[PDB]
Design an enzyme around this catalytic site. Structure first.
Site, PDB file in Angstrom:
ATOM      1  N   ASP A   3      43.183 -63.954  13.423  1.00  0.00           N
ATOM      2  CA  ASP A   3      43.393 -62.823  12.516  1.00  0.00           C
ATOM      3  C   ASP A   3      44.239 -63.266  11.322  1.00  0.00           C
ATOM      4  O   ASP A   3      45.459 -63.403  11.441  1.00  0.00           O
ATOM      5  CB  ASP A   3      44.059 -61.671  13.272  1.00  0.00           C
TER       6      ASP A   3
ATOM      7  N   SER B  21      39.346 -60.506  -6.774  1.00  0.00           N
ATOM      8  CA  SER B  21      37.946 -60.747  -7.091  1.00  0.00           C
ATOM      9  C   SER B  21      37.664 -60.346  -8.536  1.00  0.00           C
ATOM     10  O   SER B  21      38.278 -59.422  -9.077  1.00  0.00           O
ATOM     11  CB  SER B  21      37.047 -59.961  -6.135  1.00  0.00           C
TER      12      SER B  21
END
EC number: 3.4.23.22
Length: 330
Positions: A35, A199
């Site tokens: 994780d 992004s």
């Protein structure tokens, strides 16, 4: 030194991935969920309340000659629905795919939330975010990656998650045969303790690319892709019959629809998520309504590039002094 381990989806929908990890002497092998959104290594154990254990492999510190109780140390991780896992802390030897770390903090769970009990295939989590998010009190503990950094040939680990297929987590090296083209690196902000990046935009299907900054985290521990409501609305507008359902809690679509691909930007590069990756199947057995893999982040407060996005790429987690994230097509 290096390490390499195969990671396997736990079910036919790629809801999570488990990776075998050796703990203790002699080795006790547990299947852990790697994780990058958290920083605790916690496991089901002989100390877990027996009624909360349903099929999981447990870690037994009393059978490990190298296990040592960390006096007075406790841990507690909170979850979004009020539940929590918590327990005490041991230190022990931990090995991932040949890579061994001594004195790693192993957090033994005394109680776990019901959602972990319900999932018998996950024996625990191995956190790979930054160590500032570790919850051990009063003395904060380092992640497996942080403890391994000095021994690694290169302070990197890579995630190559498979679509309905096994994949690989590599530590200390970049397998130049696992990707195509070039790796595009982008800056990471560690201010919140996550592998947080920006992004450069998105496209739906074969539509025009939309230049817009999306700040989000690379999180191998989250199944879906959570993006701003404006982006998610633009995606599902191209799927005939799709709508946001309040009873289900997200966008659903007719299972007979074909889904368009989703493209997200990494600097000047483009990663394309095939439409099939966004199909997460019927909301209930026999239903003709299917659950979508792209959902709104409005209720969460952070954008999350989960497994849906990451398994479309070869992803480099560069833990150098100035950390970066690398994306390549595969």
């Amino acid at each position: 030194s290096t390490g390499s381990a195969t990671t396997t989806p736990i079910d036919s929908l790629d809801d999570a991935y488990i990776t075998p990890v050796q703990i203790g002497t002699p080795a006790q092998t547990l299947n852990l969920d790697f994780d990058t959104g958290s920083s605790d290594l916690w496991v089901f154990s002989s100390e877990t309340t027996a009624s909360e254990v349903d099929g999981q492999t447990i870690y037994t510190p009393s059978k490990s000659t190298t296990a040592k109780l960390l006096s007075g140390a406790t841990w507690s991780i909170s979850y979004g629905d009020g539940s929590s896992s918590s327990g005490d802390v041991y230190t022990d030897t931990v090995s991932v795919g040949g890579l061994t770390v001594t004195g790693q903090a192993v957090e033994s769970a005394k109680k776990v939330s019901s959602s972990f009990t319900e999932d018998s295939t996950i024996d625990g989590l191995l956190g790979l975010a930054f160590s500032t998010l570790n919850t051990v009190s009063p003395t904060q503990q380092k992640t497996f990656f942080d403890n391994a950094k000095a021994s690694l040939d290169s302070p990197v680990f890579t995630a190559d998650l498979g679509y309905h297929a096994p994949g690989t987590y590599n530590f200390g090296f970049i397998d130049t045969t696992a990707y195509t083209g070039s790796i595009t690196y982008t800056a990471v902000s560690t201010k919140q303790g996550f592998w947080e990046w920006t992004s450069t935009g998105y496209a739906v299907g074969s539509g025009t690319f939309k230049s817009t900054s999306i700040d989000g985290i690379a999180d191998t521990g989250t199944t879906l892709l959570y993006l701003p409501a404006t982006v998610v609305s633009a995606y599902w507008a191209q799927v005939s019959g799709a709508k946001s359902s309040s009873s289900v809690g997200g966008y659903v679509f007719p299972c007979s629809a074909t889904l368009p691909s989703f493209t997200f930007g990494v600097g000047s590069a483009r990663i394309v998520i095939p439409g099939d990756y966004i199909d997460f199947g019927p909301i209930s057995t026999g239903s003709s309504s299917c659950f979508g893999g792209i959902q709104s982040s409005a209720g969460i407060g952070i954008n999350i590039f989960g497994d849906v996005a990451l398994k479309a790429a070869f992803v480099v987690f560069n833990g150098a002094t100035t950390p970066t994230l690398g994306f390549a097509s595969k």
